[PDB]
Amino acid sequence: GMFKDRFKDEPVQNDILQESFINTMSAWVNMLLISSSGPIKTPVGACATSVESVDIGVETILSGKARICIVGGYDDFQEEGSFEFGNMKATSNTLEE
Amino acid sequence: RQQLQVLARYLKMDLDNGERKFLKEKDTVAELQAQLDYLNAELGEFFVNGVATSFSRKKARTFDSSWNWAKQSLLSLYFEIIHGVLKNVDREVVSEAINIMNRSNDALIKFMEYHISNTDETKGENYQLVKTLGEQLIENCKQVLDVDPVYKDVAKPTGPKTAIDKNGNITYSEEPREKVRKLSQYVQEMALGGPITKEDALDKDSTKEVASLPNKSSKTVSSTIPRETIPFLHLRKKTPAGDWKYDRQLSSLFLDGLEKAAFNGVTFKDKYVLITGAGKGSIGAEVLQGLLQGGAKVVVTTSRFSKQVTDYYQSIYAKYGAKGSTLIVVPFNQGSKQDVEALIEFIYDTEKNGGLGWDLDAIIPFAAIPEQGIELEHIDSKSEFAHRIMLTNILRMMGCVKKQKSARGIETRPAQVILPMSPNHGTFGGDGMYSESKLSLETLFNRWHSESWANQLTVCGAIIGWTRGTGLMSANNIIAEGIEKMGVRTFSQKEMAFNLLGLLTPEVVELCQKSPVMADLNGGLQFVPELKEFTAKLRKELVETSEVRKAVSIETALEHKVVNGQVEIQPRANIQLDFPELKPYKQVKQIAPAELEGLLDLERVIVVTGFAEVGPWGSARTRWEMEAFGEFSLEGCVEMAWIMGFISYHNGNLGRPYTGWVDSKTKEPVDDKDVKAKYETSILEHSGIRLIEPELFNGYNPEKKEMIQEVIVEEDLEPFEASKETAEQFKHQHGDKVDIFEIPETGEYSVKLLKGATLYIPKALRFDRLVAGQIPTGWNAKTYGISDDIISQVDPITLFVLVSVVEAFIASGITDPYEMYKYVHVSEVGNCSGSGMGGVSALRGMFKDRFKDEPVQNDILQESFINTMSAWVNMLLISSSGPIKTPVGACATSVESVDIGVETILSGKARICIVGGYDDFQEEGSFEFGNMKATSNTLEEFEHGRTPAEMSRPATTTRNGFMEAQGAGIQIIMQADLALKMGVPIYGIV
Amino acid sequence: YNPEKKEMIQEVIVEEDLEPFEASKETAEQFKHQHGDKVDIFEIPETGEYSVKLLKGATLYIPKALRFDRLVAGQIPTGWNAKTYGISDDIISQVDP
Amino acid sequence: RQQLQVLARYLKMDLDNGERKFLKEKDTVAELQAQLDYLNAELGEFFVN
Amino acid sequence: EQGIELEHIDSKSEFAHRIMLTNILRMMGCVKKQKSARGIETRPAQVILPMSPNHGTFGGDGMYSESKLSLETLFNRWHSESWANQLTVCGAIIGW
Amino acid sequence: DKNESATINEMMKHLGRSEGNPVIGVFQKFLTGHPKGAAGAWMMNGALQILNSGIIPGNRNADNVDKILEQFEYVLYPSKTLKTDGVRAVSITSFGFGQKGGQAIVVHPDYLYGAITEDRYNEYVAKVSAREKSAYKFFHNGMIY
Numbered sequence A: 001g002m003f004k005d006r007f008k009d010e011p012v013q014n015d016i017l018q019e020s021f022i023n024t025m026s027a028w029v030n031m032l033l034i035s036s037s038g039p040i041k042t043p044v045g046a047c048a049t050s051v052e053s054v055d056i057g058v059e060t061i062l063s064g065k066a067r068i069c070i071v072g073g074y075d076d077f078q079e080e081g082s083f084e085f086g087n088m089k090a091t092s093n094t095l096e097e
Numbered sequence B: 001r002q003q004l005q006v007l008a009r010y011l012k013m014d015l016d017n018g019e020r021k022f023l024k025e026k027d028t029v030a031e032l033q034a035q036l037d038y039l040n041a042e043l044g045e046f047f048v049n050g051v052a053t054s055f056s057r058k059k060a061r062t063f064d065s066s067w068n069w070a071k072q073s074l075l076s077l078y079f080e081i082i083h084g085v086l087k088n089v090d091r092e093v094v095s096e097a098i099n100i101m102n103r104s105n106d107a108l109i110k111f112m113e114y115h116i117s118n119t120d121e122t123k124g125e126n127y128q129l130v131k132t133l134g135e136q137l138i139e140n141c142k143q144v145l146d147v148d149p150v151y152k153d154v155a156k157p158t159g160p161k162t163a164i165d166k167n168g169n170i171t172y173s174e175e176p177r178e179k180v181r182k183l184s185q186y187v188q189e190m191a192l193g194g195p196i197t198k199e200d201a202l203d204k205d206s207t208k209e210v211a212s213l214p215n216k217s218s219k220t221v222s223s224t225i226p227r228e229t230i231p232f233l234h235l236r237k238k239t240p241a242g243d244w245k246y247d248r249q250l251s252s253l254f255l256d257g258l259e260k261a262a263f264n265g266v267t268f269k270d271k272y273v274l275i276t277g278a279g280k281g282s283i284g285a286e287v288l289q290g291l292l293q294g295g296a297k298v299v300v301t302t303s304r305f306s307k308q309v310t311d312y313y314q315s316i317y318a319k320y321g322a323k324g325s326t327l328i329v330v331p332f333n334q335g336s337k338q339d340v341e342a343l344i345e346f347i348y349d350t351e352k353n354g355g356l357g358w359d360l361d362a363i364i365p366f367a368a369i370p371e372q373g374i375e376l377e378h379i380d381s382k383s384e385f386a387h388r389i390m391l392t393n394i395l396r397m398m399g400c401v402k403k404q405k406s407a408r409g410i411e412t413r414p415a416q417v418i419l420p421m422s423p424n425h426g427t428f429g430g431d432g433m434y435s436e437s438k439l440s441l442e443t444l445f446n447r448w449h450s451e452s453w454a455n456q457l458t459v460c461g462a463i464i465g466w467t468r469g470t471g472l473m474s475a476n477n478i479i480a481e482g483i484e485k486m487g488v489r490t491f492s493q494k495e496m497a498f499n500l501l502g503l504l505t506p507e508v509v510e511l512c513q514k515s516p517v518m519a520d521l522n523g524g525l526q527f528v529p530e531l532k533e534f535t536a537k538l539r540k541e542l543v544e545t546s547e548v549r550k551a552v553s554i555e556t557a558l559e560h561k562v563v564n565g566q567v568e569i570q571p572r573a574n575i576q577l578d579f580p581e582l583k584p585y586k587q588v589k590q591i592a593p594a595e596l597e598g599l600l601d602l603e604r605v606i607v608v609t610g611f612a613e614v615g616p617w618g619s620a621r622t623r624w625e626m627e628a629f630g631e632f633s634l635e636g637c638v639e640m641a642w643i644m645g646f647i648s649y650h651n652g653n654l655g656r657p658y659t660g661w662v663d664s665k666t667k668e669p670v671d672d673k674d675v676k677a678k679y680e681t682s683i684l685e686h687s688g689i690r691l692i693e694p695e696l697f698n699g700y701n702p703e704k705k706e707m708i709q710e711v712i713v714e715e716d717l718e719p720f721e722a723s724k725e726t727a728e729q730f731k732h733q734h735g736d737k738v739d740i741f742e743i744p745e746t747g748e749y750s751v752k753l754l755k756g757a758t759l760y761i762p763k764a765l766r767f768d769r770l771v772a773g774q775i776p777t778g779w780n781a782k783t784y785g786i787s788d789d790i791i792s793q794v795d796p797i798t799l800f801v802l803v804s805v806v807e808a809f810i811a812s813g814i815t816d817p818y819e820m821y822k823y824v825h826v827s828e829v830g831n832c833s834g835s836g837m838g839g840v841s842a843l844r845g846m847f848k849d850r851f852k853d854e855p856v857q858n859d860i861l862q863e864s865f866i867n868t869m870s871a872w873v874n875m876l877l878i879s880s881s882g883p884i885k886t887p888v889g890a891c892a893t894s895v896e897s898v899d900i901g902v903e904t905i906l907s908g909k910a911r912i913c914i915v916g917g918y919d920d921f922q923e924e925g926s927f928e929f930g931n932m933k934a935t936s937n938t939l940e941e942f943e944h945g946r947t948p949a950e951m952s953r954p955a956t957t958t959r960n961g962f963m964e965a966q967g968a969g970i971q972i973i974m975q976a977d978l979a980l981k982m983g984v985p986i987y988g989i990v
Numbered sequence C: 001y002n003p004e005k006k007e008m009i010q011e012v013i014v015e016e017d018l019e020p021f022e023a024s025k026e027t028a029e030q031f032k033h034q035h036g037d038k039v040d041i042f043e044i045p046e047t048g049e050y051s052v053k054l055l056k057g058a059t060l061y062i063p064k065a066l067r068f069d070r071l072v073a074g075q076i077p078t079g080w081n082a083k084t085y086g087i088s089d090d091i092i093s094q095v096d097p
Numbered sequence D: 001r002q003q004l005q006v007l008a009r010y011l012k013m014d015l016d017n018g019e020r021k022f023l024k025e026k027d028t029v030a031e032l033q034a035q036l037d038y039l040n041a042e043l044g045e046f047f048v049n
Numbered sequence E: 001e002q003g004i005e006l007e008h009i010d011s012k013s014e015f016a017h018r019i020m021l022t023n024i025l026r027m028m029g030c031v032k033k034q035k036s037a038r039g040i041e042t043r044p045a046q047v048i049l050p051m052s053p054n055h056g057t058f059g060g061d062g063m064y065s066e067s068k069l070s071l072e073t074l075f076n077r078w079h080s081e082s083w084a085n086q087l088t089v090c091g092a093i094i095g096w
Numbered sequence F: 001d002k003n004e005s006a007t008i009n010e011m012m013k014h015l016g017r018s019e020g021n022p023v024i025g026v027f028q029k030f031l032t033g034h035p036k037g038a039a040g041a042w043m044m045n046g047a048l049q050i051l052n053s054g055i056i057p058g059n060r061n062a063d064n065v066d067k068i069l070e071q072f073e074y075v076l077y078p079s080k081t082l083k084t085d086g087v088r089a090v091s092i093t094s095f096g097f098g099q100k101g102g103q104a105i106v107v108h109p110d111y112l113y114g115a116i117t118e119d120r121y122n123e124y125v126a127k128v129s130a131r132e133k134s135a136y137k138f139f140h141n142g143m144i145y
């Protein structure tokens, strides 16, 4: 939305920037369900993000900063990321398949 | 052409309409130009350019937070005493005690009581001194807790002294007067007068002088006026014949008021004053300090509104602004009538209408411009503009104030007009229209009775005497002593300001309300006969002495050298790392509790051992120098020059052999002493928060932002040749709305976009955020040693991270990161730093540049990941297999990184961790922060007169958005036990 | 997104003036700011609108389609909707998928 | 009109040159008028005349 | 200038002050410059200055009193500057 | 700014900070601006430099402190640099988008050494002097080359 749709002058919400942040999902979780003021540490670990999140959560509870932690991972699929994984040859070519 | 003419005639279209209109417009231009040229030949360029407007309401600056400046002023004085910068024999202690007392309230008293009561007087004589002084000051501020602030000047009175050296060097200095050491003695001396006019613990115990300050201190000084003597300062009275003559009673009133002021201080609370002509180095400036000390509400004008002048006025308010006082600084041109009307309207308009809502009690119009060497035959544009400023617009401002008070029915709150008058009217000559302006100012004494504005304005003419210092009377300071040798008095600007503020005392105000007052502050100079000739003689004798001595000494030196036929060292920059100072074990043990020894598990104490950064002001060293001292040292200047690429190191043949710095562009040698003079202006102009430079952000120009708009084609386009693959891509996109046909002789294809197809036309947009905190221009990762291949591979943020990591390890004394593996396993070095958005430039590459089919590297996706900076750090420097946890916390990323690193070491997963944060600045993020209104609008900042260096002002009344910056910061944290074992510096405990 | 027809744009220099097209004054001024001498804008006196005339040598962008060879993905079942779970329309329109 | 446009393009004649120059001149006029208006608001009509 | 008090001083008062003070100074300067450019140091022009006894006594006359009072600096300018060989000052206080 | 002042003031009031002892506020973004993620790191570097120098930089763009902030009696807002006789601890706070609040406390390093013996301290001091001499040599060679 902010890198292409705004360039083409198409209607984009004025706060689209905040919706892109990797910690915005946790912010929305807390703002709609949890309402806690406990630790928030958002890992970024590519494909090992979920294991890194588990490690951080375990250490957060063991340090005494929390007794309950939400851990896990998420990511979406879209055109630009698919293309760039194609240019890196990380994904399988479907025509060859 | 004939066919086209026939077609135009059939279409009823005139082909020469545009030229006809153009020729009419060109004639109108010449008419208007001729009018403008006549007006410029009539008024002159100086006047026409001088009447330009300068005032606006949005540029007004308010200063009223004296409740905060009082505690600042107290802490500053307290630490100056403790460091020995201020001692008991200084009048600065007394003056600052007065200023603190003028802002006394309950919170200030609790602030003082804490800081003084917690002072350990057994730490030194300075500590005992501060305890004593502070307790006395606490008592004084309790005593004046409910008393009105007072203007009280305790400065040592000084006199003129001109000396000529043996070589004929003329030096002028202000030396303490012998018989006068206080303002009370100054008033005594003025009251006595002179033969020509005949018709305390200060400097010994500041603490004792402070104890005296609240005490309101039995014969007046008017009694001590000799009979048949005119005091140096006196008032005058008009006789039935219309001439003004010295009056004993009025002068006694004035001098008694001056004495009371010198002893007890005068208040100006509830006084609303407008003062013009009060810039630095002027009489008005000293008047304004005294008004602020007494608690007045003052609007001061300036003809040179700038960040320097606004900072000068902030500093003045923060030092002297008493409780209940306010300072309003506005841009102003007294030579513009529209500015005069607008200023008076701003002052009188209601706050809901954007004004101040004030009613003036005093007007002090001291604005003036200098006319040097303009005789009668030279009176021209500039003299006319000065006469306008100094006579006609002061009359207009008086009329405007009258009209404002009459439109509101105010008949019982007159404004006192302190008219700056001159004793001399045509005596010296060559001053343009100055004497005419000053003499014309005297018709007001009679206008007050003959017209109908006497209930709105009272006239108070002040004949200002010979004042030494700046403005117009400077340049005459070398003859002040010679003039004073005749029993005359010349005044400093503080003295003249004290005299003028004597006219704002309650009794003089009432006297002005009864009828127009004329105060003579000429110090007896009127009794000297033939003043022009006398002063010319004095100056001529001084120049004669100087030149003769100089020439004779030169000739004697030459004759000695013909008859008979030191080495100094320049500094060179020596940049230091600044490891923490380690003190003897005895002192270090005296700090922490004795029980601490052996109490702590040192493997659970985290310590910072090194840190670095790359920001708008260079490294941590240069940023600290700018943050703390506001200026670079020689080491800081040289380092900034090296970072920005102004200078480079050379060692070899340059024909002679040279080792040192050279200019990077011209390869000319440069000494460290000359680096500042060569490069500091450029360094400061291209560092910190500044206008955005497109060269640093791939041509991004916030004033011309590029976008594209979709338009449907209304008619077929002209064919264009393209390759077969490109033509087939166009056909795939457009289908029936495009035609592609192979050119049989080339193998190429023609592309023909038809009606109804879609295109995109670029259009430019103006964005209103134009300033950013940018890394100094000239910064280059090659200067640090990063190779071209890495620079071309990675995102620009990765370079900031790499440099910061290397510099943070250097700051920890670790020059080879592999040395860590002599103490810890490879699995025990972590990296827990992150960013809020990562490689946004690679995001641009994959989201926009790929859309436009521009060359983008095939692995641009990996360069965008927020953990890719840590990956590159490990792949180029660290080579550890320890924990890697990359936080993402928007603006709290660095604190989150520190927390994660501390917990990683405490869990035993690591013993050394890299922590910190980084982020870049780019077009898309700037725009999106603009759409969220999180950043400051720069056009609104310019409307208020704010420059880029003052746009980031946290915790201020007018703060309106953040300033975006870029860079990185890194810290090395490890266990205290390993830090001690390794021998690395320790900068603090997390 | 259709991986078999990926949309891109190509920059072409105009070889001959284009046909005028009507646009609002603000849009016409943005075009003039972008193109300078390579465009002519003239107010239509009876409408208040402006004609935009892109001239020879100016820059345009023509969309062109590309065929990408990754056509398969592991996608959340078709029909999935956060409204089925109870998330409201306002949240759905506010946040990222 | 299209035939006339083709003929003008062949003749290398700009049909909007005059209007372009006229619009530049009209802007110069407004600049000069603004200067004159400021001087009249500063000096007044009695003085200027 | 009739019925122009302090608050009414405007364009017309400025133009009258120009006429009655500033352009009389300019005319004196022009005469000086003309006689100096020709080396005339012994044929001074006598300037009969129309002066007023009253300066702000009646009121409502715009800048008239300022113009007439400013005219009096010439008595001192004659000694302080260098045009005394070209012009002599003769102030006449015109009565009712 | 208002929320941060209120938060620090409540922190100090609840933990019994003495009256008349306001914490001195530092605002380094007046000079550097806001990097959206390096901010805390820059403030921490400054806090370390304050802890080792004893100098508290002033906010030179603090032309007029907002009157609303006078209510927070445990906060003082200087405009000029104060050279004190020693700082013992510095507080660093951050507030990122997405409800990311954070605080760090940095204590003067000389409080560490009271927990070790004299011999260990002297051994460490000698080791650090050697390391500093070698770091100076590396720094200047790397700078000029």
Ligand SMILES: NC(=O)C1=CN([C@@H]2O[C@H](COP(=O)(O)OP(=O)(O)OC[C@H]3O[C@@H](n4cnc5c(N)ncnc54)[C@H](OP(=O)(O)O)[C@@H]3O)[C@@H](O)[C@H]2O)C=CC1
Pocket: B276, B277, B278, B279, B280, B281, B282, B283, B284, B301, B302, B303, B304, B332, B333, B334, B335, B365, B366, B367, B368, B369, B370, B389, B420, B421, B422, B423, B463, B464, B465, B466, B467, B468, B470, B471, B472, B473
């Ligand atoms: N010995 C003496 O000094 C005597 C002084 N006086 C008179 O008393 C007054 C005292 O002022 P003093 O300090 O001596 O003289 P200065 O010339 O120093 O003061 C005039 C000030 O007015 C400001 N100013 C200049 N032009 C304009 C303008 N167009 N609009 C607004 N402000 C302007 C300037 O400050 P900035 O640019 O900073 O605003 C300038 O410093 C003067 O009017 C002087 O004629 C009379 C007799 C003797």
